[PDB]
Every structure is written in structure tokens, then in C-alpha cells.
CSV table of N, CA and C in Angstrom, one decimal:
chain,number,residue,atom,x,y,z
A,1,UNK,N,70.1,109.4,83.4
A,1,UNK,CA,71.0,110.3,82.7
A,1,UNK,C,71.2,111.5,83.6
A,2,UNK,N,72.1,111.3,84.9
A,2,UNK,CA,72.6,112.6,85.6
A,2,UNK,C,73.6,113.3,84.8
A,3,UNK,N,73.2,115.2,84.7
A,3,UNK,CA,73.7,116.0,84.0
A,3,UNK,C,75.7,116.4,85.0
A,4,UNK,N,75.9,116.1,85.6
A,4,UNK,CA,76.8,116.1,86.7
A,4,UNK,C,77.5,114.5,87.4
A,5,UNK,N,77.1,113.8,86.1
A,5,UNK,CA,77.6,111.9,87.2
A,5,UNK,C,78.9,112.1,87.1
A,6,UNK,N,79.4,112.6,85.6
A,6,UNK,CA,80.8,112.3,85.6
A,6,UNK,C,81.8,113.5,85.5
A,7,UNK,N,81.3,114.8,85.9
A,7,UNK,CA,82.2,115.9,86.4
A,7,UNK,C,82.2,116.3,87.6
A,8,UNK,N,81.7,115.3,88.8
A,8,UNK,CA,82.0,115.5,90.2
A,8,UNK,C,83.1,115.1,90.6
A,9,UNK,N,83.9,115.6,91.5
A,9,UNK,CA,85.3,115.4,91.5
A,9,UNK,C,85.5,114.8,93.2
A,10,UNK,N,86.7,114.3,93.7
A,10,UNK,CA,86.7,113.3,94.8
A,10,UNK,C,88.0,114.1,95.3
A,11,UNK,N,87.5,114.6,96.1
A,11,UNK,CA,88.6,115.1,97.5
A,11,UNK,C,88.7,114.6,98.4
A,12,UNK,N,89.8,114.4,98.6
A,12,UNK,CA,90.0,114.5,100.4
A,12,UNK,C,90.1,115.7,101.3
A,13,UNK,N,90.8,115.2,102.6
A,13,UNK,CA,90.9,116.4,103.7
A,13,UNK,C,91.8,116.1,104.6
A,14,UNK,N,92.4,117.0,105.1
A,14,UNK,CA,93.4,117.8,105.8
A,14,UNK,C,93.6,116.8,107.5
A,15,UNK,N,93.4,115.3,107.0
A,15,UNK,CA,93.0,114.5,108.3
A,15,UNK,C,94.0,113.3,108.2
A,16,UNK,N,95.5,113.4,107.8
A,16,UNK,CA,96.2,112.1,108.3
A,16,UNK,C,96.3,112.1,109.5
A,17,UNK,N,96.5,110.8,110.1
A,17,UNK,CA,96.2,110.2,111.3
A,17,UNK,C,97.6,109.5,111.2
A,18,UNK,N,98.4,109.4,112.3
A,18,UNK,CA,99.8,109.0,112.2
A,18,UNK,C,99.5,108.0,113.1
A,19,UNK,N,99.7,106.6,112.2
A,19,UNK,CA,99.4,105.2,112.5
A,19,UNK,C,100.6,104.5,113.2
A,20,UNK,N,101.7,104.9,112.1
A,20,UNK,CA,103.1,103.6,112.2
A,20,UNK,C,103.8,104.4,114.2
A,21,UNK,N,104.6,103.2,114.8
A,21,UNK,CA,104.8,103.8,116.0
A,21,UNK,C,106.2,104.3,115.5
A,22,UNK,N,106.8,104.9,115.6
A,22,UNK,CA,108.4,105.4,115.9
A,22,UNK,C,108.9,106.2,117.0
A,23,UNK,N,109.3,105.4,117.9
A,23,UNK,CA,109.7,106.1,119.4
A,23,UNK,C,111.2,106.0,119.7
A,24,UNK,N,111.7,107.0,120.0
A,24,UNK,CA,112.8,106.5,120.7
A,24,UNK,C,113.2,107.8,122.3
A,25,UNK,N,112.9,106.3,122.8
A,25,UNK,CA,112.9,106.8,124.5
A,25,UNK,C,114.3,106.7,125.1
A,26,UNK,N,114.8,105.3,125.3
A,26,UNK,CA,116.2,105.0,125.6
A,26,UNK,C,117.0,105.5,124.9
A,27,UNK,N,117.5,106.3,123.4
A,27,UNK,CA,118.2,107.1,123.2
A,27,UNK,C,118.4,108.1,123.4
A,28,UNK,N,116.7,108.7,124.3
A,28,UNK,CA,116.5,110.5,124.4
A,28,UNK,C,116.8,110.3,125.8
A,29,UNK,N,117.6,109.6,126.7
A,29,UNK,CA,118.5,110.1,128.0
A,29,UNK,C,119.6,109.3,128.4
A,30,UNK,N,120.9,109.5,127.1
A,30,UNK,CA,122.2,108.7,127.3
A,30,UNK,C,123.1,109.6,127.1
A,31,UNK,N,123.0,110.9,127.4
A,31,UNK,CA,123.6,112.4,127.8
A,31,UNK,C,124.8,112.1,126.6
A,32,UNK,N,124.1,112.6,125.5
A,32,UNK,CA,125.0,112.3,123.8
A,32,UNK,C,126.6,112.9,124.6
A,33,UNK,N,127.6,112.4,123.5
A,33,UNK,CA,128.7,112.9,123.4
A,33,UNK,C,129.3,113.0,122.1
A,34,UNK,N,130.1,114.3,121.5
A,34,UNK,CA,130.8,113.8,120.5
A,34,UNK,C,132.4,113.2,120.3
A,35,UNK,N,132.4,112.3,120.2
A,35,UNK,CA,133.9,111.4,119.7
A,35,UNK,C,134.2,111.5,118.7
A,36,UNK,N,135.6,112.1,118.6
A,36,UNK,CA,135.9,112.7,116.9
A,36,UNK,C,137.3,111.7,116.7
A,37,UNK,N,136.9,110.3,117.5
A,37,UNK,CA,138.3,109.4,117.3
A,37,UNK,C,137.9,108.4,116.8
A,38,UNK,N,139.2,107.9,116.8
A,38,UNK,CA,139.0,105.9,116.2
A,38,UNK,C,138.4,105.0,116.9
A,39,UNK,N,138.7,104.7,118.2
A,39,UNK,CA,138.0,104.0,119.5
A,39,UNK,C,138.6,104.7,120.6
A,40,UNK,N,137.8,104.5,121.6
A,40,UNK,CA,137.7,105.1,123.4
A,40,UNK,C,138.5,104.0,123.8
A,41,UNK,N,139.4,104.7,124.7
A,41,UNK,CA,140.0,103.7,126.1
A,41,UNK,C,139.9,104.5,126.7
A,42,UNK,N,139.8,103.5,128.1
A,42,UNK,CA,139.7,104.2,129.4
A,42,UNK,C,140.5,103.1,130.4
A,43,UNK,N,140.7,103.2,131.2
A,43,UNK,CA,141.4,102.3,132.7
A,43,UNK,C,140.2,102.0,133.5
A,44,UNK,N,140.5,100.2,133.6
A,44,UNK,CA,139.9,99.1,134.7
A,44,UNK,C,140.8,98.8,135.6
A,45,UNK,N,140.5,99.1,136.8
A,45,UNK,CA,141.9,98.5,137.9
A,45,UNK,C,140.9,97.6,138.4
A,46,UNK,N,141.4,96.4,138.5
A,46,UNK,CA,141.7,95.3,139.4
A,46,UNK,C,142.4,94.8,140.6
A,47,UNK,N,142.6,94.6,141.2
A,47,UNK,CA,143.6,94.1,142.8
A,47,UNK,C,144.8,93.6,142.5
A,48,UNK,N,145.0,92.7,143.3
A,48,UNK,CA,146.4,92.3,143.2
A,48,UNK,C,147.5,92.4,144.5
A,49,UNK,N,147.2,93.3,145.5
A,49,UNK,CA,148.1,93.4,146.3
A,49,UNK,C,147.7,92.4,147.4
B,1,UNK,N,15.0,101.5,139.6
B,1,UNK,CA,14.6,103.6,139.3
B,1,UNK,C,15.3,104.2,139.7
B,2,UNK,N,16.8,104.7,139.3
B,2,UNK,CA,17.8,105.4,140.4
B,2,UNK,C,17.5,106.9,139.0
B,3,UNK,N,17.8,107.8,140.0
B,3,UNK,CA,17.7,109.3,139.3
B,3,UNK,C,19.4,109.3,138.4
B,4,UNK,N,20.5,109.5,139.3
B,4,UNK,CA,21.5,109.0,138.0
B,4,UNK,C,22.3,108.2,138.6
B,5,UNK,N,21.7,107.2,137.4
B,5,UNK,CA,22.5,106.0,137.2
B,5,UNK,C,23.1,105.6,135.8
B,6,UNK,N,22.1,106.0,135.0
B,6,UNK,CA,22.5,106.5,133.7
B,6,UNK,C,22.8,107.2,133.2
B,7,UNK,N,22.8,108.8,133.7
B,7,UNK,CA,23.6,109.7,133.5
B,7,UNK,C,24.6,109.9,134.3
B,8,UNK,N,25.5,109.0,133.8
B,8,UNK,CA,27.1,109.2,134.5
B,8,UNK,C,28.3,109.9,133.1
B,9,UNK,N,29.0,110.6,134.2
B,9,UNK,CA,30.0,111.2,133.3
B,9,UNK,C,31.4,110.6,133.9
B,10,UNK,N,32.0,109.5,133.3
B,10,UNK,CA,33.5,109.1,133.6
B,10,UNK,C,34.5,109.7,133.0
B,11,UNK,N,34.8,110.5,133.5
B,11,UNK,CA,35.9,111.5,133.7
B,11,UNK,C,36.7,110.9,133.7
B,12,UNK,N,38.4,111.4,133.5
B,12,UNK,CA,39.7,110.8,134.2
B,12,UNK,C,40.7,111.8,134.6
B,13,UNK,N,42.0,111.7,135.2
B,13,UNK,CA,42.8,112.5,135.6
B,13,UNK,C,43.6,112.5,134.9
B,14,UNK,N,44.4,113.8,135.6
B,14,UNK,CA,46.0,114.4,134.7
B,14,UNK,C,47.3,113.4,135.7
B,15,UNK,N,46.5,112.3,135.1
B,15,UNK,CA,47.9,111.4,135.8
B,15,UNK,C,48.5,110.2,134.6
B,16,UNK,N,48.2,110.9,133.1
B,16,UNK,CA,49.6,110.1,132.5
B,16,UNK,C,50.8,109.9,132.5
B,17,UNK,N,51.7,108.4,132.7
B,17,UNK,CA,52.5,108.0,133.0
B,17,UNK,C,53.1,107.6,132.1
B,18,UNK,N,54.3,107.7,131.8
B,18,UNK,CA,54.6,107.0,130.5
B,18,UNK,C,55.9,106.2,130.9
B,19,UNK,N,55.6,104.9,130.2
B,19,UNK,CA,56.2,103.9,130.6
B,19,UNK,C,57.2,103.4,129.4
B,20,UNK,N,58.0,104.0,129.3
B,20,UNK,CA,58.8,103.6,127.8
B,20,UNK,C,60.3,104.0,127.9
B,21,UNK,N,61.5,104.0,127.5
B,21,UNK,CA,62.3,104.0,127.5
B,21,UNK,C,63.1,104.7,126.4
B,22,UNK,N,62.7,105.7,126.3
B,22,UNK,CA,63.5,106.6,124.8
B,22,UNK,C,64.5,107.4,125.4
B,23,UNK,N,65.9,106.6,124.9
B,23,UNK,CA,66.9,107.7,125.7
B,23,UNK,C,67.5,107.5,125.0
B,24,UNK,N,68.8,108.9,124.9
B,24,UNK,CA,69.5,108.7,123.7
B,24,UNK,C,70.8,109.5,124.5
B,25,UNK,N,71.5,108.2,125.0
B,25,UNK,CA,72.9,108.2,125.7
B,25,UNK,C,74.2,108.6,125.0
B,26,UNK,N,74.4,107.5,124.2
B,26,UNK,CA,75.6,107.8,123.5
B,26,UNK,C,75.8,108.5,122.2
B,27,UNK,N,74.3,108.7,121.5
B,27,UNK,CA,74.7,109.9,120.8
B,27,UNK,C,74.1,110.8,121.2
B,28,UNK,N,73.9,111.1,122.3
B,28,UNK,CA,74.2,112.6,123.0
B,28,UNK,C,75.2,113.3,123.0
B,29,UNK,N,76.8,112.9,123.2
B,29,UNK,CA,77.9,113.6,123.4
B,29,UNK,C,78.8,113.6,122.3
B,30,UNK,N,78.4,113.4,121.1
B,30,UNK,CA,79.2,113.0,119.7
B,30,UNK,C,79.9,113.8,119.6
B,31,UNK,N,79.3,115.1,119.6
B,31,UNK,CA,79.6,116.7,119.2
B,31,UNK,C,79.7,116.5,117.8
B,32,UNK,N,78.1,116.7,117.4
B,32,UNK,CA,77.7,116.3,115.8
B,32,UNK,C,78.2,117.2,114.8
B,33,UNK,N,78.4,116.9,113.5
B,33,UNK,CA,78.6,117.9,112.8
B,33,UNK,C,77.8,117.7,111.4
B,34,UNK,N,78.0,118.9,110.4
B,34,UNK,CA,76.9,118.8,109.4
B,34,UNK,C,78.5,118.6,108.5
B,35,UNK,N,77.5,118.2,107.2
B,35,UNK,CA,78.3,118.0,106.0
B,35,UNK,C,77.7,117.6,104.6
B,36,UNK,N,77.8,118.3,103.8
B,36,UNK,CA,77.1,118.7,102.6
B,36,UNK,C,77.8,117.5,101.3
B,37,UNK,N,78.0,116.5,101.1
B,37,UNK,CA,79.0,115.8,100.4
B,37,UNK,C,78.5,114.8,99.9
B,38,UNK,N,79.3,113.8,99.7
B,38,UNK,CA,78.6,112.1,98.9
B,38,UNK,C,79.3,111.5,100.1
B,39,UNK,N,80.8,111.6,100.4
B,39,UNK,CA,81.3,110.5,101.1
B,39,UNK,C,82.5,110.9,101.9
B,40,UNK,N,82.7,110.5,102.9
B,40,UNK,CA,84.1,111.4,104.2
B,40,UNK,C,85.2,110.8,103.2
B,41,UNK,N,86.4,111.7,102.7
B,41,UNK,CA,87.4,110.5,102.4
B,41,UNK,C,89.0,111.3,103.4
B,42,UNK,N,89.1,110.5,103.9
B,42,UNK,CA,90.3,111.3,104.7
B,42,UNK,C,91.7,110.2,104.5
B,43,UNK,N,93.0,110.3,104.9
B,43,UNK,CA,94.3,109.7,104.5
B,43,UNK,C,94.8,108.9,106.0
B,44,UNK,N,95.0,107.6,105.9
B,44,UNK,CA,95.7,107.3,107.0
B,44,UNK,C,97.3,106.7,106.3
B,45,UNK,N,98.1,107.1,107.0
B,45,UNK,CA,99.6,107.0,107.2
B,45,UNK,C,100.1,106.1,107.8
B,46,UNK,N,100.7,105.3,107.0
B,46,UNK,CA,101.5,103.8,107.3
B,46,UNK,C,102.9,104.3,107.6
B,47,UNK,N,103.6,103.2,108.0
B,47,UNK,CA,105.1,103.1,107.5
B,47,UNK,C,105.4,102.6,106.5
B,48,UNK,N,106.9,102.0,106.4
B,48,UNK,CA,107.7,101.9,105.0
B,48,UNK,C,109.0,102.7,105.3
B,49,UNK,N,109.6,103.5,105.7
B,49,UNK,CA,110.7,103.9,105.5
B,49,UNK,C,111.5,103.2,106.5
């Protein structure tokens, strides 16, 4: 018959540990741009003469 | 009839060697700590989003 069994209380601590991976490498050097259009064109030349 | 032969004093020397292996390698460099408690409870972090 402990005077204290069932008003001891259960804490934690100030210790998450960041498990899941989330990286993004190949996005962080494709020198962003903003496009405020519908779609991009641009000119392909080919030969012919 | 030897004068001493029975009174001998066998002596020994300060040459204890000790042949044993008590080393304590790896928890040598834990960098221990104290803690007053029932049980560590700390948070690990999954994904999901």
C-alpha cells in the first residue's frame, strides 16, 4: 500500500528526434523563375539549307 | 645438527603482478549523466503528412 502509487505523474522531455526523411536537393538549384502566363514558348531552329 | 636450519624466515618481495584484465573501454566515454526518476520517456517523430 504505496502512499504516492497513484499520484505520480508521467512526463516527458524536450527530446524529439526528427525520424521521417524530407529533402529536397534537385529543387534547391533550378534558379526558380516566376511565370505569370498560360504556357512558355520559345524557338527551336533546325537546318534546312 | 645445522645451527639454522630451522630457524628460517621466508620472506617475499614487492613484486606483485597482477594478471587480470579489468578495463572499462566503452563506458569510459558515455559522458554519463545522473537522473533522479522511474523511467526516460522522450518523443520520436514519424511522418504522415
Amino acid at each position: 500500500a504505496k502512499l504516492n502509487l497513484a499520484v505520480l505523474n508521467n512526463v516527458f522531455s524536450e527530446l524529439l528526434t526528427q525520424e521521417i526523411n524530407r529533402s529536397a536537393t534537385f529543387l534547391g538549384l533550378l534558379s526558380k523563375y516566376p511565370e505569370r502566363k498560360s504556357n512558355i514558348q520559345w524557338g527551336v531552329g533546325m537546318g534546312g539549307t
